[PDB]
Amino acid sequence: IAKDSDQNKIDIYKNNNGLFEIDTQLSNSVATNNGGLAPSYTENRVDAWGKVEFADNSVLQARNLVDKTVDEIINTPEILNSFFRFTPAFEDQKATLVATKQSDTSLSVSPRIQFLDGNFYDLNSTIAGVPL
């Protein structure tokens, strides 16, 4: 964190085989917080949170998962990793889907994604008790 003139700016330096170099795209990704405590999420962009594309609903019929119940699927995290394709912003950045039962017949999923600090963030994350 530095000031060029008088406002604070966030640069991210990435270690490359023992030598740190600025990453200008990741710097812009992290610095785009829109006044929030953490970097924005954009659906169509590899941002600080990588990029998550969900499967169409039509995957259930094609793979015969309609014969599985919500509780089965919900306790089978390898099935529900097959509900999205993830593009990491930095090598070995990881992401999983947290599942929530919505009805007898349906669930929702929401990504849990590592940031630069090796930690996973999701909808309920806090720092100092403050929801992000």
Partner 1 sequence: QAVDETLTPWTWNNNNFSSLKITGENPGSFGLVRSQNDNLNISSVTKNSSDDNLKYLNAVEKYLDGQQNFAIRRYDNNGRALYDINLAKMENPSTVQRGLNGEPIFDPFKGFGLTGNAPTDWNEIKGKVPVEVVQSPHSPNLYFVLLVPKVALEYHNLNNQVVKESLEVKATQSSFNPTQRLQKDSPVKDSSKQGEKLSETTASSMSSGMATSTRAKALKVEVERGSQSDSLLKNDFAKKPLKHKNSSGEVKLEAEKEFTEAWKPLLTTDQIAREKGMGATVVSFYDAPYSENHTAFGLVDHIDPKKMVENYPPSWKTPKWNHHGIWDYNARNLLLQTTGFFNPRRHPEWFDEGQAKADNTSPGFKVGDTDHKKDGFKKNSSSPIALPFEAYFANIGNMVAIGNSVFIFGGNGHATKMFTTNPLSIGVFRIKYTDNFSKSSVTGWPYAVLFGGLINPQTNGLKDLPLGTNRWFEYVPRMAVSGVKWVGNQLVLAGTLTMGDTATVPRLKYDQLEKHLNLVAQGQGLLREDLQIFTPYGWANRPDIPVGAWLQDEMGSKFGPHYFLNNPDIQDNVNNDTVEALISSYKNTDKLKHVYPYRYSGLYAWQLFNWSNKLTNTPLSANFVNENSYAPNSLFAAILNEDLLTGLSDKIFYGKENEFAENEADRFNQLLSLNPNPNTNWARYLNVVQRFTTGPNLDSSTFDQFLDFLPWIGNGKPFSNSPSSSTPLPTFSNINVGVKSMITQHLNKENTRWVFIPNFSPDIWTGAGYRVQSANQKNGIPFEQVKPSNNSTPFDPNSDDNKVTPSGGSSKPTTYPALPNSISPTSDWINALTFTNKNNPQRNQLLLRSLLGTIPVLINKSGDSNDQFNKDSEQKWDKTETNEGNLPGFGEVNGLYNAALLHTYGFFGTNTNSTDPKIGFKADSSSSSSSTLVGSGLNWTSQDVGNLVVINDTSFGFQLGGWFITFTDFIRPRTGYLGITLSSLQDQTIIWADQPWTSFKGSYLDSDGTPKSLWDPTALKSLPNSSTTYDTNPTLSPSFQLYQPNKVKAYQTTNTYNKLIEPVDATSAATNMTSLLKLLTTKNIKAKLGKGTASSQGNNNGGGVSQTINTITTTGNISEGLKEETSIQAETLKKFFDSKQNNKSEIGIGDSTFTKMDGKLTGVVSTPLVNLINGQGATSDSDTEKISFKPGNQIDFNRLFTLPVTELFDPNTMFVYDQYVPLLVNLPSGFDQASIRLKVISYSVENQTLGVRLEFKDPQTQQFIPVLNASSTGPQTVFQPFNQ
Site string for partner 1, 8-47 (x = CB under 8 A): --------xxxx----------------------------
Q: Catalogue the long-range contacts made by 109-117 (C-beta closer than 8 Å, 24 or more residues apart).
A: 109/54, 109/80, 109/83, 109/84, 111/49, 111/52, 111/84, 111/86, 113/49, 113/50, 113/52, 115/48, 115/49, 116/12, 116/26, 116/30, 116/48, 116/90
CB of 65 to partner 1, least distance (A): 9
Residues in touch with K ion (CB under 5 A):
47, 49, 51
Write down the H helix ranges in 1-132: 24-31, 59-62, 70-74, 77-80
Least gap, CB of 45 to K ion (angstroms): 5
Tell which one of 9, 63, 85, 101 touches partner 1 (CB under 8 A): 63
Span of 3-11, 61-69, 99-107, 108-116 interacting with partner 1 by CB under 8 A: 61-69
Which of K ion, partner 1, none is residue 63 near (CB under 5 to 8 Å by kind)? partner 1
User: Would you count residue 58 as binding partner 1 (CB under 8 A)?
Assistant: no
Nearest to 116 by CA among 34, 1, 13: 13
How many chain residues are in contact with partner 1, going by CB under 8 A? 9
